[PDB]
Amino acid sequence: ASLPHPKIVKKHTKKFKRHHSDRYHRVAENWRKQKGIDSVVRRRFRGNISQPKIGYGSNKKTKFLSPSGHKTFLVANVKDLETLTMHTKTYAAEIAHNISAKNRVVILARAKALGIKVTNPKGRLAL
Amino acid sequence: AESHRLYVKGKHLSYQRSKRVNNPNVSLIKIEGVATPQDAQFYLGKRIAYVYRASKEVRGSKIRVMWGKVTRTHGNSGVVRATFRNNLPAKTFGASVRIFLYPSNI
Amino acid sequence: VEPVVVIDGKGHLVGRLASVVAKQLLNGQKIVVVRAEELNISGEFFRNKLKYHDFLRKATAFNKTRGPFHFRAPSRIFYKALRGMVSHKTARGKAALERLKVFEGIPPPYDKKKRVVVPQALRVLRLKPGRKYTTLGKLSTSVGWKYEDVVAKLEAKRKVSSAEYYAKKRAFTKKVASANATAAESDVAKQLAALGY
Amino acid sequence: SAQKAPKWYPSEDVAALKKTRKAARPQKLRASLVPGTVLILLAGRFRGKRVVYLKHLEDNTLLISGPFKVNGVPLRRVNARYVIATSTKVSVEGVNVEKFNVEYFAKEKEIKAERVEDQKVVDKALIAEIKKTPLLKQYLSASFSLKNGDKPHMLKF
RNA sequence: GAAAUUGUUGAAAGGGAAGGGCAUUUGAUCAGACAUGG
RNA sequence: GGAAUACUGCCAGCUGGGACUGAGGACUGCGACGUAAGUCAAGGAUGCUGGCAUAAUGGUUAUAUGCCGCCCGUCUUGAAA
RNA sequence: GCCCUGAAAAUGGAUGGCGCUCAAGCGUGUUACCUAUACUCUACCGUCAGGGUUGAUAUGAUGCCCUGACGAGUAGGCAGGCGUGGAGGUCAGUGACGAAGCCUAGACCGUAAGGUCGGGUCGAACGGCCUCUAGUGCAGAUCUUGGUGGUAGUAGCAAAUA
RNA sequence: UUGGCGGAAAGGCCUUGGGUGCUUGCUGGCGAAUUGCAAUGUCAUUUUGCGUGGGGAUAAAUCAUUUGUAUACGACUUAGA
Numbered sequence: 013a014s015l016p017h018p019k020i021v022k023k024h025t026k027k028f029k030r031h032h033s034d035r036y037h038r039v040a041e042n043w044r045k046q047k048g049i050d051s052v053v054r055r056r057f058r059g060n061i062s063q064p065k066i067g068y069g070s071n072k073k074t075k076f077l078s079p080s081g082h083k084t085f086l087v088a089n090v091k092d093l094e095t096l097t098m099h100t101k102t103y104a105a106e107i108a109h110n111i112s113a114k115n116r117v118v119i120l121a122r123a124k125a126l127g128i129k130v131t132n133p134k135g136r137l138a139l
Numbered sequence: 140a141e142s143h144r145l146y147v148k149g150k151h152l153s154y155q156r157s158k159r160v161n162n163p164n165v166s167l168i169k170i171e172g173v174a175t176p177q178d179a180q181f182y183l184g185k186r187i188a189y190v191y192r193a194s195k196e197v198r199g200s201k202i203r204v205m206w207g208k209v210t211r212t213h214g215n216s217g218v219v220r221a222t223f224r225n226n227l228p229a230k231t232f233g234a235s236v237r238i239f240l241y242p243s244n245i
Numbered sequence: 246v247e248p249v250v251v252i253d254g255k256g257h258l259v260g261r262l263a264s265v266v267a268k269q270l271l272n273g274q275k276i277v278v279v280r281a282e283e284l285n286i287s288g289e290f291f292r293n294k295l296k297y298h299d300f301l302r303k304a305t306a307f308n309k310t311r312g313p314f315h316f317r318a319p320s321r322i323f324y325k326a327l328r329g330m331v332s333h334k335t336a337r338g339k340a341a342l343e344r345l346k347v348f349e350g351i352p353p354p355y356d357k358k359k360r361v362v363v364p365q366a367l368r369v370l371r372l373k374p375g376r377k378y379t380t381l382g383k384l385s386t387s388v389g390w391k392y393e394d395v396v397a398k399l400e401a402k403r404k405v406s407s408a409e410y411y412a413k414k415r416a417f418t419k420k421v422a423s424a425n426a427t428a429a430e431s432d433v434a435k436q437l438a439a440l441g442y
Numbered sequence: 443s444a445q446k447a448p449k450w451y452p453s454e455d456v457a458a459l460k461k462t463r464k465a466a467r468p469q470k471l472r473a474s475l476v477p478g479t480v481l482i483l484l485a486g487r488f489r490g491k492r493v494v495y496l497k498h499l500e501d502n503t504l505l506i507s508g509p510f511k512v513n514g515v516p517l518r519r520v521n522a523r524y525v526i527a528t529s530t531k532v533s534v535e536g537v538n539v540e541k542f543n544v545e546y547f548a549k550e551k552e553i554k555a556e557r558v559e560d561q562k563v564v565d566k567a568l569i570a571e572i573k574k575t576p577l578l579k580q581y582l583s584a585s586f587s588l589k590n591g592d593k594p595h596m597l598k599f
Numbered sequence: 600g601a602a603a604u605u606g607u608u609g610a611a612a613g614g615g616a617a618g619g620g621c622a623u624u625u626g627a628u629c630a631g632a633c634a635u636g637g
Numbered sequence: 638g639g640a641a642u643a644c645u646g647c648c649a650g651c652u653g654g655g656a657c658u659g660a661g662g663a664c665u666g667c668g669a670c671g672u673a674a675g676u677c678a679a680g681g682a683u684g685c686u687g688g689c690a691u692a693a694u695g696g697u698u699a700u701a702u703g704c705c706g707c708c709c710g711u712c713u714u715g716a717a718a
Numbered sequence: 719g720c721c722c723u724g725a726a727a728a729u730g731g732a733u734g735g736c737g738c739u740c741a742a743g744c745g746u747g748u749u750a751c752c753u754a755u756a757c758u759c760u761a762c763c764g765u766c767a768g769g770g771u772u773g774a775u776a777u778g779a780u781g782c783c784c785u786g787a788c789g790a791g792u793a794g795g796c797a798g799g800c801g802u803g804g805a806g807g808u809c810a811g812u813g814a815c816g817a818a819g820c821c822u823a824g825a826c827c828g829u830a831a832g833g834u835c836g837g838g839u840c841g842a843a844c845g846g847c848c849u850c851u852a853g854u855g856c857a858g859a860u861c862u863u864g865g866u867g868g869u870a871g872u873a874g875c876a877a878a879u880a
Numbered sequence: 881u882u883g884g885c886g887g888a889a890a891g892g893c894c895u896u897g898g899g900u901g902c903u904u905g906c907u908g909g910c911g912a913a914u915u916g917c918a919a920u921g922u923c924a925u926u927u928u929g930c931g932u933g934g935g936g937a938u939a940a941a942u943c944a945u946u947u948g949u950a951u952a953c954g955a956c957u958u959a960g961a
Binding site: 016018022025026031032035036046047048049050051052057058059060079 | 660662695696697705706707708709710711712713716717
Binding site for chain 4: 904910911912913914915916917918919921
């Protein structure tokens, strides 16, 4: 249901967790680069956490693609849903978190009608 | 025929490694009866399997297989380099392994 | 290429035997070394008794009970040598040694199991003639091994039984090689001979 | 809106391939594979079985027989790389064998009466030729396996 | 009605710390698939 | 006296086994083999076959195993101190 | 030359360890083999440089496209981005048929700062894009305020007759 | 099943006699496919619970109390049908 695209290669699937985020509660996993003078991580000694650098960048040809092969698009309603009308093999729709349950059946309706793939159906869904 | 074996005995010795760094992507096998790199050239390309047991049955068996192939010789004494579809567990350093006769170019 | 390998300890050089054995384990081979009392070290008695004593004075200063342990028996003297050649503190090391047994004399099951030798560790293949060496048992008994005489007394009793055993065997292989004489030159005999057998 | 609309959008025209330049040339089997040669199957359903090479089918495969009333293998396809080719060998002059191709094996359970008939046709001539050399028939029915202190890399076959 | 810290339940590991990195075994969990004549 | 062989070197001489890669996506270029129409290994892989369904496969996670990894921040020629 | 004497220090100990004696030691030679983030070929990320192309010719001209080379980094400089309170403009944006917030070894996107979704909880508001603005991002300061631990059911609860 | 032998951890070994399955020492008669050209096809022995049918056996230790050969508290040594 989507364009060709080469096999998605991910290059570094793991997280990059800030050094010692695993040591003290007070320190969030959120990446932050060490500045310290003797720091093993900054100085890149064998045996430590790898730091995010540009060599890890994804293939432009596969960048931003999900498994399905589409880039996802945040959809708030039908007007928004409808921008992806010609680009049905290229993009997928994602229904915003704050979209009410009843409205979700309407966007969901119109997508099927247009053949746009939805990423988060089974959303605010009874049963 | 108490014997049914169509494979050569083998032992998983190590990963590829320097003194203090290993490479789990490559594995070193001792093939039973091979003693020289000139012998070990016979098995280049042959298929290896490491066969283990489990608790969960999958396709009706509690026996599982890790398949790989002999890729080149190692050192001077018949030891050989091998890569498997996944990477041998390292717990198995000393475990047995199977070198088959196919692809034959006999 | 074998389940378990029993090694007749005699005539071997400790460290050379240790190195070949300690490698077998890390490869999966189940080893069991016997007669560790008649094991050899190059260099005559006095040097090794001096070396052993040089090892014997090391201990935790505040609590000798926790510093280096000095096992005196030949089987454990060799086991010292081996373990020094295995990365034992790690799990892999633990498991390797858990494939090994070392015995002074040849105690039961192996009493009827063929022992083998390791040439590259065999003194008489490795030592230059004229060079002095050592008998581990005589060493161990000089550093507190209370049982050289017991194993001696038993080994004699064991070799006597073995003597009559091999005599029996030697008598039967006779019959086999004296009841072959007929079949020695049949047709199938010449038939076999053609293909090497 | 939840997300500002993109300003480009690709094209959903899926392109055609460049004129690829690969051209199937025939596969020349190795020298030890002459028709009639006793083969050892090293894999699959009839692994270990000793078997007679008959024909190089057009899809690279080796027509096999065994033959059936000797060891159980029927007329059968078999790939060359899972086979040891021995030195021992039977003749195959008096075996017709032309009717057998890819389509003979074409997946169009049951067991066709044509297949069972062709078997006895082809086999009859083989068991005929096989039986002249003593113990060849016996050999073919025994299964192959490595013994303690076999070294494939030196054994001759 | 967050966190520190705590009780209970459940899974797991633990021969003088714990935590981390590359790799895989095992266990758990989660996926992308979608369309072909009745 | 007539050779052979070693050593060294060249061949736009022939060939067996093993390994990793297959980026690119109409045509366009330089060629090769053909008397020929044509064909080709010539500006980047194709062909044939089979396998996977409460499954193959992959992601994460816990544990185990192999190797490896001292506490950050700081002043300092020099910090695990 | 090698070996021996000359050669005495305080916890128990160090050719790294085991151990090694025609060595696994000393001198010399010849092959083979092991292995770096280096070298060679290739994919991808980025940076720089050179070049092609809006001639009518749908959606990116600060764009598409071709080619070559390059990538260490404290103090430090510049650049391109991520997130926050409030402002003008715009999606006639989401919302009591559930906003914001919170929880979640569930999922997806980004090299990353971060973004998005599911489920649970919740109950009145809130967001995307173009711009404006600053009391705009914390691990440290014997930092400020508040809250909570190990220590620990521990020290202890014994002067003054009962 | 008849005799022995084995205490270094003997826990195994020799031996008598028949019974029974097989016997490729040799000569016959059948079967095998379609598991589709490899992938997945010998089941090993540990433990632990339950299900049966046969044989078998019918206790102690601890708390409490007590002694003082003992004792900081546990512990130790006594005694109680």
